[PDB]
C-alpha cells in the first residue's frame, strides 16, 4: 500500500509527513531523535518500492498545550524541519497538509517586516484554534447539528447541485471532520482526498468553479476546495414556500422523514440566500421546525404553519439592520472613532469586564468593520460572521477561565446560533457602581508624543474605558466635550517646547473640567 | 416507511320504514299522546347530552346529568297542564250532559210539577258548577304555562326563528294560543255576575219548593217567572261557546295550550335526550334513526342507539322502544296540530293519517391503523374519493384528539376519533345516505392519498307500511 502512497505527490513530502506525525503525538522528545526516526521509516518506505482503544490511548497522550514552550541560507532543510517539528509539537492537532502549505510560504518568503512575521504565525494559530472550536462544536451539539450547519454551508456554496448530492457531500464531510477531530490521520486526510476526488469526478453537477482545483495536485486541490468561490444560483428558482409552506402535505412529508424534509428546507433557503450568515440560516431552520412541530399536531396545520414567513422576517431584520447601521457609522467615523464608540457601548452594557479585555475587543471589532464594510452587502453578513465567530469565541473562552460577569456567562453557554443576538440587545448594566476615582490613571507624560501612533491609540482608549467605569452618566454631550478638549490638549501640549510642563499644567485644568461637571 | 392501513366496512344497505297511523284529532286522544311524551320524560329522567353561547344555557348547565335535574319544574308544569286539560275535557262532558230547560207553561201544575222544577234547578246549578270548574282549570293551565316558560326554556319555547335545524326552539305557537286564552278567559270572567245570579236563583227555588204548592205557585204565577228563563238562556249560550267554541272557549284554548306546549318542550329539549340504552345483551347495536320531517319539507333525524351503549334505566338513557313511543306520539301530535287542528271539545273528532318514518342499518365505523410515524403528535384526517369526483376531505382530528373538524356535507352524521395508544384512527358514520358511496382513506393532514383506502357501497330501501 506504500506504493500508491509514495508515487503520489513525490518523495519529499513523505519525509516531513512522518516527522510531524509523531512530533504531534509525542511532543517533549527532542529534535535529532525525531530526524533519525524519520529516516528510519522513510528509507524502509523507499525499500518496499491501530485498534480503536489503542488510538484513544494515543489521543489521551495528546497534550493540547505542552510544557516545552542566516540559518535558512545555511541549511533550510533542517531549518524548516525544526520549524515544522516545533509547530507540530506545539499544537498536536494542527492541520497537517496546511502545515506543509505554510512551510511552502515559509521557505518562499525566506528566499525572497512586521506583517510578514506577525500575521503569518497568528493566522496559523488562529486556524489551529478553529478546528479545536469545530471539534468542541461537534461534541455537545452533536452530529445532527454539524449536519445541519454543513448542509446550509455547502448548499450556499453549490446551489446548482441537487439535494441528493448536497446531502451526500454532507455525510462524508461529517465523517471527515469526525476523523480529523479524533486526530485519526489514518482515516482523515485520505477521506479528505477521497471527497476531493469524488467532487472532481462529478464536478459538473456540483459547480464549474472547481475546474481550477482539480488541475492542482492532491494537496492544494482539497485546500482550494475548501476555498472555492460560491457558484451562482439558477436565478430562476421558485419561492421555496410553494414547496414548503404554501403547499399542502407539509406535515405528510415531515412525517415521511423529519430531518430529511428539514434538510430540504435548509438546502433550498441557503442556496437562495448566500448573503445570509450560516447562523441565520440555522435560525430560520429552527424556527420552521418548531413551527412544524406545533402545527402538525393540530386539526388544521395548513392555517397554522401559514404565515410562518412572518416569523422569518424579524430574524433576518435584526442582523441586517445592525450590519448597515454599524457600517454607515464606521464609514463616517473612521476606524479609530468607530473603535472609541465601540468602547463606550460595550463598557456601558458590561463594565465588569477588565479594561484591557474591553480594549482589544473594541479594537478588533473596528477591524471587523474595516474589513467587511468595504465589501458590498451581498458578502457583508458572511464576512461578518467569519470574524465575529472567532472574536466572540475568543472572549468567551477567556471568560470561562476568569468569570467576570453573569450576562456574558449566560450568553457564552447558550446556543451558538443565538450568541451574537444575545450579546446584542444587552442593555446598559443597571446598578453598576461608579468606580472609585483615582487620578493616577489621568496622568499624561511626554512619552505619548514619542510613542508610536498605534501605541498612542491604546493609551487613549484605555483611559476612555476606565473613564466610562467612573460616573456612568454618559450623555454624548459630556463625552464629546471631553473628547474635544482632551484631543486638543494632547496635541497642543505635544507641540510645546517643554511638553513635561504643558502636560502637568493643563491636566488638572481639564480634570477640574472633567469633574465639577457631571 | 409510514403505513396507513384502512380496515373499515364495505357494503351498507340502509332500510327505512314509513308506517302511517290512522288516529283522530279529538282532544282526549291528543292528550294521551302528550302524556306519553311528558310522563316518559319525568318517570325515566334521561341524561342530557353534555354538548358556548350558541348552545342553550341549560345545555352547558345541566348537560351530562339527568333531565329532571334541569327540567324538573318544567316537566311538572307540563304534566299539570296535561292532567288539568284532561279534567276540562271531562268537565265539558258533564257540562253538556246537564243542560237546563226553559219554563214552558207559566201558569200550570199538570206539567211544571214540583219534581220538574226540582230537576230543573238541579240542572241549573250543575251546569253553573261545571262552567266554574273549567274556568278555574283554564286559568290553572295558564299559570302552569307561565311556570313552564320563564325558566330554562324561556327565549326557547314561544320563539321559532339541508339547512340549519330548528331544534331548541318552541316553534309551536304557544304565545298565540296563550294570548287567545287570556282574552277568552277575560270575557268569561266578565260573565261571572250572570253565572253567580243563576247559581243563587236555582238555590232560591230549591228552597221555595219547600213552601206550599198552591201558596208558592200563587206568587210564582205572578217576578221569578221569566227570571229563570232569562237566567237559563245566558247559561246555555255560555255553555255552547264554552264547549263548542274555539278562540272563544277558555277550555279549548287551555287544551290547545297544553298540547302545543308539550310539542314546544320536546322541540326545545328533546334532541338532548339520550336514548339507545341497552336492556339485555350489553352492547346491542339497536341503532335506529328516528326521522323528524317538519311540515315544510326540511327533515332532520335523531340517531338513538349505537362505548356508546349503556343501560336503559331511570336517570340512565332510554330504550329504543321508549323513544319509539315518544316519536309516534310526537308525529301524531305534530300533525293534527299543524294540519287538522284541535276538534272542538264537544265535537267527536276527525280522522288523520300521521306517518312515522324510522330507518335502520345506517351506521358504520372505519379504522385506520397508522404506523411508521409519530402518530401521537400528528393531526390525522379522513378523505374519500368517489368515482370521477375530486378527493373530498370529510373530517380531521388534532394530535391529542380534542380538536375535530368536519366538512359541511358530513357535518351532523360522521364523527372522527383517534386512539393515540394503539395508534388507530376511527371514523364513525351514522345516518349515511347512498351519496356516501366512496372509497375512504385516512391521511396525515389531508389532500392526496398514500394508502389502500376503504370500501365504497351504500344502498337505501324504503317501505311504506300501513
Residue numbers in the entry:
A (entry chain A): 6 to 54, 94 to 113, 125 to 167, 178 to 583
B (entry chain B): 1 to 51, 61 to 170, 183 to 243, 252 to 335, 348 to 507
Show passages lifted from the paper:
Human serum albumin (hSA) is a nonglycosylated protein of 66.5 kDa comprising three homologous domains (I, II, and III) that assemble into an asymmetric globular heart‐shape module with up to eight distinct fatty acid–binding sites (Linciano, Moro, et al., 2022). Each domain is divided in two subdomains termed A and B that are composed of four and six α‐helices, respectively (Curry et al., 1998). hSA is characterized by a remarkable solubility, high stability, low immunogenicity, an average concentration in the bloodstream of 600 μM, and a circulatory half‐life of about 3 weeks (Peters, 1996). This long half‐life is mainly related to both its large hydrodynamic diameter (~5 nm) that hinders renal filtration and its ability to bind the neonatal Fc receptor (FcRn) (Sand et al., 2014). In this context, the small and stable heavy‐chain‐only nanobody NbAlb1, capable of binding both human and murine albumin, has recently been successfully applied to improve the stability and prolong the in vivo plasma residence time of multiple small therapeutic candidates. To unveil the molecular basis of such an interaction, we solved the crystal structure of human serum albumin (hSA) in complex with NbAlb1.
To stabilize the protein complex, we grafted NbAlb1 onto a large and rigid circular permutated protein derived from H. pylori (c7HopQ) to produce a chimeric molecule, called a megabody (Mgbc7HopQ NbAlb1, henceforth termed Mgb). To stabilize hSA, we carried out co‐crystallization trials in the presence of myristic acid (Myr). The crystal structure also revealed that within the Mgb, the NbAlb1 domain adopts a bent orientation if compared to analogous fusion chimeras developed for cryo‐EM studies (Uchański et al., 2021), thus proving a certain degree of plasticity of the hinge region connecting c7HopQ and NbAlb1. We were able to easily trace the electron density of hSA residues for domain II, though it was less defined for the other two domains. In terms of the binding interaction, all three complementarity‐determining regions (CDRs) of NbAlb1 make contacts with hSA, establishing multiple noncovalent interactions with residues located at the peripheral extremity of domain II and covering a total interface surface of 560 Å2. More specifically, NbAlb1 interacts with two sides of a groove defined by α‐helix III of hSA subdomain IIB (residues 313–323), a flexible loop (358–P366), and the disulfide bond (C361–C316) that joins the two lobes of the groove. Within this surface, four main hydrogen bonds strengthen the binding of NbAlb1 to hSA. NbAlb1 binding to hSA promotes the formation of noncovalent interactions that shield the surface of multiple hydrophobic residues of both NbAlb1 (F27, F32, G33, I98, G100, and L106) and hSA (C316, Y319, A320, C361, A362, A363, A364, and P366). Our study was the first to examine the binding mechanism of nanobody NbAlb1, revealing that this molecule interacts with an epitope located in subdomain IIB of hSA.
